[PDB]
Amino acid sequence: MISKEYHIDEEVGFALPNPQENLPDFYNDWMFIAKHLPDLIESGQLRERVEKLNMLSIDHLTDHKSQRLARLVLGCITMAYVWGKGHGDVRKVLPRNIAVPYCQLSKKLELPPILVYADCVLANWKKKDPNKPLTYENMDVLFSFRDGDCSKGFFLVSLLVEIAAASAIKVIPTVFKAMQMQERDTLLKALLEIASCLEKALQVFHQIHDHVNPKAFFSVLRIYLSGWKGNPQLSDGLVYEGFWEDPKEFAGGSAGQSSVFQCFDVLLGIQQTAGGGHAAQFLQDMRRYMPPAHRNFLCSLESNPSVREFVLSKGDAGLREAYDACVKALVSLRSYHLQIVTKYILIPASQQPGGTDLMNFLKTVRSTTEKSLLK
Ligand SMILES: O=C(Nc1ccc(F)cc1)C1(c2ccc(-c3cnc(C(F)(F)F)cc3CO)cc2)COC1
């Protein structure tokens, strides 16, 4: 098993197992607003309602799950406050009452004070029936922004890919154990098992089309996930009133923030963070937007010896093929992600009376992955 300090679950991987839904009664004023985002945003009273809050101490958030739920609550409210109805009228100052505890909590959890993937995917879910399995029909999100925003489909399908990935993640220790102990047959089997699970993950990824509509994603959800780093709407970032005097820039939610998005690249020695380019920069930067336990896990993967070099040094076509099977599965996942950006961002952007930067990042990532094929 993976060490408990890395907060990786056998079943759900990097996802937070059975997330907490309700905070203490002390935080009811946060919870009410977060649970009623569709109505409060629509009616133009979210902002005043945030502005009416008293400053609540973070001391009553005792356990990790309650602390993560509070991050999810505060993060969603923050995006709602900043972006409002999503029509370009923006707040450049986050009020003291909310900003101080959010930044305090964020400092405690070692995450930046913005909604990240780890909040809105990994901690933003529940089973409808706890006795039934982890499928789309038996699941839903904890929070959404707007009616018809497709947050359920977008967050949960991301989560399901993340859960499919967990089957591969748990094999990682078998890979490194097999190398140090020089167990070629065991290593071969482990790599084939990883390939299998990543192929399954791709089939799970196909569900995005069933539950997410392009127009709604591009024109609504994408707006609420946007950040204030290199964003002309908040050119100098966002003022967190009471915590920092000067405005600070933070990137919005991204698949690049997923630990699965990087961990197989690291495992297999696909040097995604090498070469000094923009994509390498972004992936490294996005480790700061992951929970510390997961950044630490990626660190420990880096610090183990290279699987690529081991396979390359052995003159073993069988091992080479099992490694390539992993690389090829990653290639297909990257290609599929690209196809999704085309349908969900590029095309809607063209029909509107930008998205290229994301496409270029992903093309770089895919290209690097292809170039790692040994045959
Ligand atoms: O953008 C996405 N979700 C997202 C959610 C919240 C947010 F704040 C921002 C974004 C989508 C996506 C989901 C999974 C991958 C993915 C793809 N490939 C690998 C791989 F590394 F295994 F190849 C891992 C993941 C990670 O599991 C890529 C995108 C959903 O449909 C787009």
UniProtKB/Swiss-Prot annotation:
Tissue: Expressed in mature dendritic cells located in lymphoid organs (including lymph nodes, spleen, tonsils, Peyers's patches, the gut lamina propria, and the thymic medulla), in some epithelial cells of the female genital tract, as well as in endothelial cells of term placenta and in lung parenchyma. Weakly or not expressed in most normal tissues, but mostly inducible in most tissues. Expressed in more than 50% of tumors, either by tumoral, stromal, or endothelial cells (expression in tumor is associated with a worse clinical outcome). Not overexpressed in tumor-draining lymph nodes.
Any Pfam family hit: IDO
Pathway where it operates: Amino-acid degradation; L-tryptophan degradation via kynurenine pathway; L-kynurenine from L-tryptophan: step 1/2
GO annotation, cellular component aspect: cytoplasm; cytosol; smooth muscle contractile fiber; stereocilium bundle
Binding note for cofactor: Binds 1 heme group per subunit. In the active form, the heme iron is in its ferrous state Fe(+2). The catalytic cycle does not alter the oxidation state of the heme, but IDO1 is prone to autoxidation.
Binding site for heme b: H337
InterPro entries: Indolamine_dOase, Trp/Indoleamine_2_3_dOase-like
Alphabetized GO MF terms: electron transfer activity; heme binding; indoleamine 2,3-dioxygenase activity; metal ion binding; tryptophan 2,3-dioxygenase activity
Cofactor(s), by name: heme b
Additional remarks: IDO1 is the target for therapy in a range of clinical settings, including cancer, chronic infections, autoimmune and allergic syndromes, and transplantation.
PROSITE patterns, sorted: IDO_1, IDO_2
Full protein name: Indoleamine 2,3-dioxygenase 1
SUPFAM superfamilies (alphabetical): Indolic compounds 2,3-dioxygenase-like
The enzyme's E.C. designation: 1.13.11.52
Function: Catalyzes the first and rate limiting step of the catabolism of the essential amino acid tryptophan along the kynurenine pathway. Involved in the peripheral immune tolerance, contributing to maintain homeostasis by preventing autoimmunity or immunopathology that would result from uncontrolled and overreacting immune responses. Tryptophan shortage inhibits T lymphocytes division and accumulation of tryptophan catabolites induces T-cell apoptosis and differentiation of regulatory T-cells. Acts as a suppressor of anti-tumor immunity.
Biological process according to GO: 'de novo' NAD biosynthetic process from L-tryptophan; female pregnancy; inflammatory response; kynurenic acid biosynthetic process; L-tryptophan catabolic process; L-tryptophan catabolic process to kynurenine; multicellular organismal response to stress; negative regulation of interleukin-10 production
Regulation affecting activity: Activity is inhibited by and MTH-trp (methylthiohydantoin-DL-tryptophan), modestly inhibited by L-1MT (1-methyl-L-tryptophan) but not D-1MT (1-methyl-D-tryptophan).
Induction of its expression: By IFNG/IFN-gamma in most cells. Exogenous inflammatory stimuli induce the expression of IDO1 in antigen-presenting cells such as dendritic cells, macrophages and B-cells.
Gene3D superfamilies: 1.20.58.480
Enzyme class of the recorded protein, top EC level: oxidoreductase
Similarity section: Belongs to the indoleamine 2,3-dioxygenase family.
Predominant location category: cytoplasm
Swiss-Prot/TrEMBL catalytic activity: D-tryptophan + O2 = N-formyl-D-kynurenine; L-tryptophan + O2 = N-formyl-L-kynurenine
